[PDB]
Amino acid sequence: KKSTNLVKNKCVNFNFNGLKGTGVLTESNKKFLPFQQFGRDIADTTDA
Amino acid sequence: QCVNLTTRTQLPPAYTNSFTRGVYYPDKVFRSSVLHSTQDLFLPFFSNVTWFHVITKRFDNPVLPFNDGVYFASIEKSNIIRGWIFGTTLDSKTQSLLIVNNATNVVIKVCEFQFCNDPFLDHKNNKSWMESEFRVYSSANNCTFEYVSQPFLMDLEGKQGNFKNLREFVFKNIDGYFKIYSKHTPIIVREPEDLPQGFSALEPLVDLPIGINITRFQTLLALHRSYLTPGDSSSGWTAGAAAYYVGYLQPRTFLLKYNENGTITDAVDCALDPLSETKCTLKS
Numbered sequence: 102k103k104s105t106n107l108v109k110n111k112c113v114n115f116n117f118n119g120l121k122g123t124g125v126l127t128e129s130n131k132k133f134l135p136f137q138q139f140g141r142d143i144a145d146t147t148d149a
Numbered sequence: 150q151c152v153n154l155t156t157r158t159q160l161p162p163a164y165t166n167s168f169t170r171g172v173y174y175p176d177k178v179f180r181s182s183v184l185h186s187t188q189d190l191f192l193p194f195f196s197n198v199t200w201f202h203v204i205t206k207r208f209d210n211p212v213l214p215f216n217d218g219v220y221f222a223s224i225e226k227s228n229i230i231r232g233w234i235f236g237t238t239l240d241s242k243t244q245s246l247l248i249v250n251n252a253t254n255v256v257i258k259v260c261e262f263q264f265c266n267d268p269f270l271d272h273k274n275n276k277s278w279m280e281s282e283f284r285v286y287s288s289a290n291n292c293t294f295e296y297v298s299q300p301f302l303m304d305l306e307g308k309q310g311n312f313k314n315l316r317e318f319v320f321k322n323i324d325g326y327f328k329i330y331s332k333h334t335p336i337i338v339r340e341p342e343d344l345p346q347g348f349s350a351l352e353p354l355v356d357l358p359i360g361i362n363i364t365r366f367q368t369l370l371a372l373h374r375s376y377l378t379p380g381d382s383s384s385g386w387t388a389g390a391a392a393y394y395v396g397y398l399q400p401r402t403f404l405l406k407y408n409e410n411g412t413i414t415d416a417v418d419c420a421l422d423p424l425s426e427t428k429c430t431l432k433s
């Protein structure tokens with residue numbers, strides 16, 4: 102479809118790689134696995 | 150065309166206990182500093198696995214089954230084990246799958262192969278070490294899938310050093326999707342008897358939408374022939390020291406302790422002994 106810009110800390114709707122959601126998209130400093138791109142917490146909610 | 154092989158020595162299969170082996174990431178989601186309960190297909194803890202050795206000449210090339218996924222471990226030094234065949238009949242009556250790590254590429258073929266009863270592993274090694282003959286199958290009628298990976302060079306030189314390769318693989322086949330998880334490690338100079346203790350997590354590597362049925366699988370070897378191996382096309386050859394362990398997967402509930410970077414530092418079963426069940430139910 103389309104390729105837009107990147108929005109810094111501000112309440113904005115997002116569809117990162119086809120992941121519909123709403124929330125502030127801040128920077129993160131957590132190491133990742135080079136086969137997974139998702140992220141969850143104790144409550145099993147998308148976080149990163 | 151193919152020929153029946155001879156001069157093989159029969160030995161009963163040995164058994165060895167598995168020490169905390171066969172743990173892989175089950176999904177594509179990253180978690181940090183949690184204790185997650187996953188009900189998936191794993192290798193049961195402290196279950197024992199089948200042992201095969203190759204060096205009489207110890208020609209061990211049997212036909213093992215494929216129930217619900219397979220854990221395959223290999224202690225190796227010079228890439229003796231190369232190829233992997235999967236199928237139901239292996240006589241061109243039904244589709245079959247094949248992975249070959251030959252000199253050209255990593256070839257994956259989903260074809261109606263009329264596999265021989267004893268497919269050779271010719272790899273005729275002159276002063277230089279390449280493959281000169283190919284008698285794995287005879288012909289294919291009309292197949293579906295061919296894939297060739299990135300072309301890379303390979304040595305095949307007859308290295309006869311110490312054991313420094315430990316390769317672990319997990320095979321799954323769910324809903325027509327064939328999945329390979331893997332982990333390769335250089336093992337230190339160590340006594341060559343069995344697989345040491347410790348932990349390791351197998352990152353997912355390959356997913357293929359083959360959509361075929363697999364019931365039986367077989368491994369292949371790399372026989373080397375020189376002036377020291379007199380004989381006809383199926384008598385004189387050299388194999389080299391290597392061993393491989395085979396285990397079968399079962400549906401179990403595990404508890405994995407994700408570390409604070411994202412890797413599985415430890416895992417515990419929930420059906421082995423009452424202490425494990427207590428740990429599972431208390432999530433501690």
Ligand SMILES: *[C@@H]1O[C@H](CO)[C@@H](O)[C@H](O)[C@H]1NC(C)=O
Pocket residue numbers: 164197
């Ligand atoms: C290992 O597994 C085989 C599977 O048939 C079983 O016969 C044997 O009792 C098990 N235990 C040992 C110590 O070999």
Ligand SMILES: *[C@@H]1O[C@H](CO)[C@@H](O)[C@H](O)[C@H]1NC(C)=O
Pocket residue numbers: 131132409410
């Ligand atoms: C990764 O692991 C090691 C120790 O566990 C260390 O580099 C660091 O604490 C961890 N986290 C990072 C690098 O973000």
